[PDB]
Design an enzyme around this catalytic site. Structure first.
Site, PDB file in Angstrom:
ATOM      1  N   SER A 144      64.611  66.827  17.253  1.00  0.00           N
ATOM      2  CA  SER A 144      65.567  65.710  17.290  1.00  0.00           C
ATOM      3  C   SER A 144      66.970  66.291  17.435  1.00  0.00           C
ATOM      4  O   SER A 144      67.222  66.971  18.441  1.00  0.00           O
ATOM      5  CB  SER A 144      65.324  64.812  16.080  1.00  0.00           C
ATOM      6  OG  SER A 144      63.934  64.546  15.951  1.00  0.00           O
ATOM      7  N   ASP A 251      60.638  57.872  23.817  1.00  0.00           N
ATOM      8  CA  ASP A 251      61.091  58.334  22.504  1.00  0.00           C
ATOM      9  C   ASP A 251      61.749  57.188  21.727  1.00  0.00           C
ATOM     10  O   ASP A 251      62.556  56.441  22.279  1.00  0.00           O
ATOM     11  CB  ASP A 251      62.076  59.492  22.709  1.00  0.00           C
ATOM     12  CG  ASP A 251      62.515  60.140  21.404  1.00  0.00           C
ATOM     13  OD1 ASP A 251      61.953  61.180  21.007  1.00  0.00           O
ATOM     14  OD2 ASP A 251      63.436  59.608  20.776  1.00  0.00           O
ATOM     15  N   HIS A 295      58.363  58.806  17.266  1.00  0.00           N
ATOM     16  CA  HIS A 295      59.405  59.682  16.741  1.00  0.00           C
ATOM     17  C   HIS A 295      58.806  60.878  16.003  1.00  0.00           C
ATOM     18  O   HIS A 295      59.531  61.553  15.262  1.00  0.00           O
ATOM     19  CB  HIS A 295      60.344  58.913  15.801  1.00  0.00           C
ATOM     20  CG  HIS A 295      59.681  58.464  14.533  1.00  0.00           C
ATOM     21  ND1 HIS A 295      59.025  57.255  14.422  1.00  0.00           N
ATOM     22  CD2 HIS A 295      59.556  59.070  13.329  1.00  0.00           C
ATOM     23  CE1 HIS A 295      58.530  57.134  13.203  1.00  0.00           C
ATOM     24  NE2 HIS A 295      58.834  58.223  12.521  1.00  0.00           N
TER      25      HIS A 295
HETATM   26  C1  LIG Z   1      71.330  63.615  17.745  1.00  0.00           C
HETATM   27  N1  LIG Z   1      69.978  63.408  18.234  1.00  0.00           N
HETATM   28  N2  LIG Z   1      68.977  62.810  17.527  1.00  0.00           N
HETATM   29  C2  LIG Z   1      67.883  62.772  18.257  1.00  0.00           C
HETATM   30  O1  LIG Z   1      66.845  62.295  17.879  1.00  0.00           O
HETATM   31  C3  LIG Z   1      68.192  63.378  19.485  1.00  0.00           C
HETATM   32  C4  LIG Z   1      69.542  63.769  19.425  1.00  0.00           C
HETATM   33  N3  LIG Z   1      70.372  64.423  20.436  1.00  0.00           N
HETATM   34  C5  LIG Z   1      71.260  63.642  21.303  1.00  0.00           C
HETATM   35  C6  LIG Z   1      71.845  64.211  22.432  1.00  0.00           C
HETATM   36  C7  LIG Z   1      72.675  63.469  23.254  1.00  0.00           C
HETATM   37  C8  LIG Z   1      72.940  62.134  22.954  1.00  0.00           C
HETATM   38  C9  LIG Z   1      72.365  61.560  21.829  1.00  0.00           C
HETATM   39  C10 LIG Z   1      71.524  62.313  21.011  1.00  0.00           C
END
Ligand SMILES: Cn1[nH]c(=O)cc1Nc1ccccc1
Ligand SMILES: *[C@@H]1O[C@H](CO)[C@@H](O)[C@H](O)[C@H]1NC(C)=O
Length: 350
Positions: A144, A251, A295
């Site tokens: 994530s 996702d 998720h």
């Molecule tokens: C912070 N985050 N949490 C997730 O599940 C995935 C991300 N990375 C992300 C990268 C660019 C824009 C938005 C999120």
């Protein structure tokens, strides 16, 4: 169990100035797995203050336990982890709320410290004295926000080890659920916290954190446009280290930021999202992208159960290892589903 060590350099801190740290289980193996935890981010005073009251372990080490149990790819039991069960295992808690990009200390001008990029560098430096100096492979993994962190930091770890005199350690990256699209949203809101699209929230965050991105990506997009490097399909082609990408086609975090929570308009929206994600992975040779609404992440104990074209992720990762010793008979590394709706793959998490 993995044992906590707080950083000896107590100037490298979590958001509230408490020392950052890592959990370690040694395998007296020349393989090292350093795993970056996830957990969203905050980008101004008000939403960081809110996070400090109800998500404090993501902003502070004051309450961390002395040990943790390794699960999924961090398990030491071959039954649970067919891939790297005998590796040296490191879990780095996410306590900087900056997608692992920040380089700013708490001070008279800054209420919080955002030191994610420096936490990774200090962990690596301190591990070199505990056996990392003898490594053959260092795999920087993450889920994530930690998966986006892998993409932002894997080449900086490679450069750090080269400059400290360890050119024989092969640095690689494993980015799980951190490959997002700056796409059209299903319903539209101008940018408070819940209405702010990721592109706008990350633009503001970089300024608040003193965020840093990979140098070759920064040189492409230039000043004011560094937010582009937080999007996998844009930063990946600038990276030199080998990176394996794991991403659900549908996702749950991507759909949430797209304001999706089924009639014809939404059906087409969801199907087009899957097709777009598949398109961005067409030229990514090491990847695992099942057609699931999920998720779930690679530190879950049942991570071996999902398959693409009959191949599990632990197998794909093993085939990736072999490929870095031309495609291998029956040992594939590029596994992207082609069916167009969540759970059209029967092995999806329940
Ligand atoms: C912070 N985050 N949490 C997730 O599940 C995935 C991300 N990375 C992300 C990268 C660019 C824009 C938005 C999120
Ligand atoms: C502690 O970390 C900071 C931030 O990277 C660095 O500037 C400083 O040199 C470090 N101190 C020591 C003694 O390593």
């Amino acid at each position: 169990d993995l044992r906590l060590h707080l950083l000896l350099n107590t100037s490298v801190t979590c958001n509230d100035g408490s020392p950052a740290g890592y959990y370690l289980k040694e395998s007296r193996s020349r393989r090292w797995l350093l795993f970056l935890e996830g957990g969203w981010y905050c980008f101004n005073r008000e939403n960081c203050d809110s996070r400090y009251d109800t998500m404090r372990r993501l902003m502070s080490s004051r309450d961390w336990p002395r040990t943790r149990t390794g699960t999924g790819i961090l398990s030491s039991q071959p039954e649970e982890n067919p891939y790297w069960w005998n590796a040296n295992m490191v879990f780095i808690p996410y306590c900087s709320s900056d997608v692992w990009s920040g380089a700013s200390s708490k001070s008279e001008k800054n209420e919080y410290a955002f030191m994610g990029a420096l936490i990774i560098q200090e962990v690596v430096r301190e591990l070199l004295g505990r056996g990392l100096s003898g490594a053959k492979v260092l795999l920087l993994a993450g889920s994530s926000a930690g998966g986006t962190g892998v993409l932002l930091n894997v080449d900086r770890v490679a450069e750090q080890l080269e400059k400290l005199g360890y050119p024989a350690i092969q640095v690689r990256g494993l980015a799980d659920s951190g490959w997002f699209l700056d796409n059209k949203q299903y319903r539209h809101t101008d940018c408070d916290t819940i209405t702010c699209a990721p592109t706008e929230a990350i633009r503001r965050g970089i300024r608040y954190w003193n965020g840093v991105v990979p140098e070759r990506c920064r040189r492409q997009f230039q000043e004011g446009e560094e937010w582009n490097c937080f999007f996998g399909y844009k930063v990946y082609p600038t990276l030199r280290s080998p990176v394996f990408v794991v991403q659900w086609l549908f996702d749950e975090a991507q759909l949430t930021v797209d304001n999706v929570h089924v009639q014809e308009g939404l059906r087409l929206y969801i199907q087009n999202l899957g097709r777009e994600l598949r398109h961005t992975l067409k030229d990514v040779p090491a990847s695992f992208a099942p057609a699931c609404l999920s998720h779930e992440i690679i530190i879950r104990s049942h991570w071996t159960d999902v398959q693409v074209k009959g191949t599990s992720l632990p197998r794909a990762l093993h085939c990736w290892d072999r490929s870095l010793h031309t495609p291998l008979k029956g040992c594939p590394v590029h596994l992207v589903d082609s069916c167009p709706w969540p759970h059209c793959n029967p092995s999806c998490p329940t």
